[PDB]
Amino acid sequence: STNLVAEPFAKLEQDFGGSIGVYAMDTGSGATVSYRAEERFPLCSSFKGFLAAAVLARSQQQAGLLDTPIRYGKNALVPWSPISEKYLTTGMTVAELSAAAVQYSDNAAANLLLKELGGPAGLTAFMRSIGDTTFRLDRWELELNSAIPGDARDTSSPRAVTESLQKLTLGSALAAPQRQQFVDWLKGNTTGNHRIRAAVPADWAVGDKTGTCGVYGTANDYAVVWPTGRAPIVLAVYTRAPNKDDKHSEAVIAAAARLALEGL
Numbered sequence: 403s404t405n406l407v408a409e410p411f412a413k414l415e416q417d418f419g420g421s422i423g424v425y426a427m428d429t430g431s432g433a434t435v436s437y438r439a440e441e442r443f444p445l446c447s448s449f450k451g452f453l454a455a456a457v458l459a460r461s462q463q464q465a466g467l468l469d470t471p472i473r474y475g476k477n478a479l480v481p482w483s484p485i486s487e488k489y490l491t492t493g494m495t496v497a498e499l500s501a502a503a504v505q506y507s508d509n510a511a512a513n514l515l516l517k518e519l520g521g522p523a524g525l526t527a528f529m530r531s532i533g534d535t536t537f538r539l540d541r542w543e544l545e546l547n548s549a550i551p552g553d554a555r556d557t558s559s560p561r562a563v564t565e566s567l568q569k570l571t572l573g574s575a576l577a578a579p580q581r582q583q584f585v586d587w588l589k590g591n592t593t594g595n596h597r598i599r600a601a602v603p604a605d606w607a608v609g610d611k612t613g614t615c616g617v618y619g620t621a622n623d624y625a626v627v628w629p630t631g632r633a634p635i636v637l638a639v640y641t642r643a644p645n646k647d648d649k650h651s652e653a654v655i656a657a658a659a660r661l662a663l664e665g666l
């Protein structure tokens with residue numbers, strides 16, 4: 403990938419202080435916008451969207467997987483697990499765990515689903531099977547958030563994120579019912595209102611998955627966006643920064659999303 407009118411991104415990046423990674427594709431025309439699209443960024447919680455997709459893929463071979471109740475214990479409840487916390491006394495079904503992971507970034511729910519899939523290596527294997535050779539998940543929540551500069555653990559690239567997202571939501575990687583369920587989960591996300599969603603015209607439908615590592619200014623969002631009467635746009639906006647204490651910026655993510663969309 404390349405971009406011969408990259409200066410707007412370059413200036414936004416310089417003002418932010420860190421690194422911005424953008425890839426956006428118009429699935430109707432094939433046009434793309436890129437900026438550090440081939441460079442590795444920490445996934446943070448954005449792996450949870452692909453995790454739910456991997457669950458749906460398995461459910462195509464395992465009848466009633468999604469309906470399976472999980473009666474998890476208190477010591478599954480790592481921090482930032484609001485749904486799993488709320489429902490501890492009842493347990494939750496695999497489907498509910500998947501929805502909570504996507505729509506609230508629920509940590510405990512992600513760990514429980516990772517265990518069902520064979521851990522970070524199992525999710526990574528799923529991603530290889532749809533043709534993503536960049537994605538790697540190595541660790542569990544919360545250790546995967548360390549976001550250390552240059553660490554390839556728990557990273558992917560904006561372009562591979564977008565390409566996989568397109569395969570899973572719009573392409574053929576998931577069966578049509580599973581594909582619709584994944585799209586619906588993304589559309590019901592509650593964590594992304596200040597990121598890509600803040601850049602999209604109010605009348606376009608959006609599904610998204612956010613990520614927030616909590617360190618090194620590292621945060622991200624990927625989304626499928628449905629313009630008026632048009633084929634959908636798929637995009638990914640990732641950030642990081644060189645100092646552990648650097649704050650992430652939702653406004654930067656929104657602004658880079660807007661530059662991508664305006665570029666398309």
Ligand SMILES: C[C@H](CS)C(=O)N[C@H](B(O)O)c1ccc(F)cc1
Binds near residue numbers: 446481482506509543
């Ligand atoms: C250690 C950090 C706290 S800022 C964390 O748990 N991040 C996950 B994720 O991005 O991997 C997370 C972040 C925000 C949430 F609301 C839920 C889960």
